[PDB]
Protein backbone atom coordinates (compact mmCIF):
# COMPACT_ATOMS: atom_id res chain seq x y z
CA UNK A 1 0.00 0.00 0.00
CA UNK A 2 2.00 2.93 1.32
CA UNK A 3 5.04 3.47 3.54
CA UNK A 4 3.40 5.05 6.56
CA UNK A 5 3.44 4.36 10.28
CA UNK A 6 1.06 6.25 12.56
CA UNK A 7 1.20 6.37 16.33
CA UNK A 8 4.54 7.53 17.69
CA UNK A 9 5.79 7.11 21.25
CA UNK A 10 6.24 9.70 24.01
CA UNK A 11 9.92 9.89 23.13
CA UNK A 12 10.49 9.57 19.39
CA UNK A 13 13.84 11.33 19.73
CA UNK A 14 15.80 8.07 19.57
CA UNK A 15 13.76 6.96 16.55
CA UNK A 16 14.90 9.66 14.11
CA UNK A 17 18.37 9.67 15.71
CA UNK A 18 19.19 6.13 14.57
CA UNK A 19 17.25 6.62 11.31
CA UNK A 20 19.90 9.04 10.04
CA UNK A 21 22.52 6.34 10.56
CA UNK A 22 20.49 3.83 8.58
CA UNK A 23 19.76 6.31 5.78
CA UNK A 24 23.37 7.45 5.46
CA UNK A 25 24.96 4.11 6.24
CA UNK A 26 27.17 4.39 3.16
CA UNK A 27 27.89 8.06 3.81
CA UNK A 28 29.74 8.50 7.14
CA UNK A 29 30.63 12.10 6.27
CA UNK A 30 26.99 13.20 6.28
CA UNK A 31 26.29 11.40 9.55
CA UNK A 32 29.45 12.83 11.15
CA UNK A 33 28.34 16.36 10.34
CA UNK A 34 24.92 15.64 11.81
CA UNK A 35 26.57 14.79 15.12
CA UNK A 36 28.66 17.97 15.02
CA UNK A 37 25.56 20.13 14.66
CA UNK A 38 24.00 18.26 17.59
CA UNK A 39 27.02 19.15 19.73
CA UNK A 40 26.41 22.86 19.13
CA UNK A 41 22.89 22.44 20.46
CA UNK A 42 24.20 20.42 23.42
CA UNK A 43 26.44 23.39 24.19
CA UNK A 44 23.41 25.70 23.90
CA UNK A 45 25.32 27.71 21.29
CA UNK A 46 22.29 27.60 19.03
CA UNK A 47 18.53 27.56 19.56
CA UNK A 48 15.61 26.07 17.67
CA UNK A 49 15.84 28.42 14.59
CA UNK A 50 19.61 28.02 14.80
CA UNK A 51 19.84 24.25 14.44
CA UNK A 52 17.19 24.30 11.70
CA UNK A 53 19.41 26.57 9.61
CA UNK A 54 22.22 24.01 9.74
CA UNK A 55 19.95 21.07 8.89
CA UNK A 56 18.54 23.00 5.93
CA UNK A 57 22.07 23.21 4.54
CA UNK A 58 23.22 19.67 5.35
CA UNK A 59 20.15 17.72 4.30
CA UNK A 60 19.46 20.03 1.35
CA UNK A 61 18.87 16.94 -0.78
CA UNK A 62 16.61 15.41 1.88
CA UNK A 63 13.93 17.99 2.85
CA UNK A 64 11.82 15.15 4.28
CA UNK A 65 14.17 14.82 7.24
CA UNK A 66 13.85 18.48 8.17
CA UNK A 67 10.10 18.61 7.50
CA UNK A 68 9.36 15.38 9.35
CA UNK A 69 11.38 16.63 12.32
CA UNK A 70 8.80 19.40 12.74
CA UNK A 71 6.25 16.78 13.74
CA UNK A 72 8.88 14.57 15.38
CA UNK A 73 9.18 17.11 18.18
CA UNK A 74 7.31 16.25 21.42
CA UNK A 75 7.79 19.71 22.90
CA UNK A 76 5.34 22.06 21.22
CA UNK A 77 1.80 23.47 21.58
CA UNK A 78 0.82 20.56 23.83
CA UNK A 79 -0.42 21.10 27.39
CA UNK A 80 2.74 21.34 29.47
C1 LIG B 1 13.92 13.73 16.75
C2 LIG B 1 15.23 12.95 16.75
C3 LIG B 1 16.42 13.88 16.97
O1 LIG B 1 16.48 14.84 15.91
N1 LIG B 1 17.24 15.96 16.17
C4 LIG B 1 17.37 16.85 15.18
O2 LIG B 1 18.08 17.84 15.33
O3 LIG B 1 16.71 16.65 14.01
C5 LIG B 1 17.02 17.72 13.10
C6 LIG B 1 18.50 17.63 12.72
C7 LIG B 1 16.18 17.56 11.83
C8 LIG B 1 17.95 16.17 17.44
C9 LIG B 1 18.26 17.66 17.63
N2 LIG B 1 17.16 18.41 18.28
C10 LIG B 1 16.75 19.74 17.77
C11 LIG B 1 16.22 20.59 18.93
C12 LIG B 1 15.72 21.95 18.43
C13 LIG B 1 15.24 22.81 19.60
C14 LIG B 1 14.59 21.76 17.41
C15 LIG B 1 16.52 17.83 19.38
O4 LIG B 1 15.63 18.41 19.99
C16 LIG B 1 17.01 16.45 19.80
C17 LIG B 1 18.39 16.57 20.43
C18 LIG B 1 18.33 17.35 21.75
S1 LIG B 1 17.20 16.58 22.96
C19 LIG B 1 17.89 14.95 23.05
N3 LIG B 1 17.10 15.70 18.54
C20 LIG B 1 16.27 14.60 18.30
O5 LIG B 1 15.45 14.23 19.14
Curated annotation (Swiss-Prot):
Residues 8-74 form the PAH domain. Ubiquitinated by RNF220 that leads to proteasomal degradation. It comes from the Eukaryota. Disulfide bonds: none annotated. It is found in: Nucleus. Residues 28-74 are annotated as: Interaction with REST. Acts as a transcriptional repressor. Interacts with MXI1 to repress MYC responsive genes and antagonize MYC oncogenic activities. Interacts with MAD-MAX heterodimers by binding to MAD. The heterodimer then represses transcription by tethering SIN3B to DNA. Also forms a complex with FOXK1 which represses transcription. With FOXK1, regulates cell cycle progression probably by repressing cell cycle inhibitor genes expression. Component of the SIN3B complex, which includes SIN3B, HDAC2 or HDAC1, PHF12 and MORF4L1. Interacts with FOXK1/MNF, MXI, MAD, NCOR1 and SAP30. Interaction with SUDS3 enhances the interaction with HDAC1 to form a complex. Interacts with CRY1, HCFC1, MAD3, MAD4, MAEL, REST, RNF220 and SETDB1. Interacts with C6orf89. Interacts with MYT1L. This is Paired amphipathic helix protein Sin3b. It comes from Mus musculus (Mouse). The gene is Sin3b. The chain holds residues 32 to 98 of 1098 of the full protein.
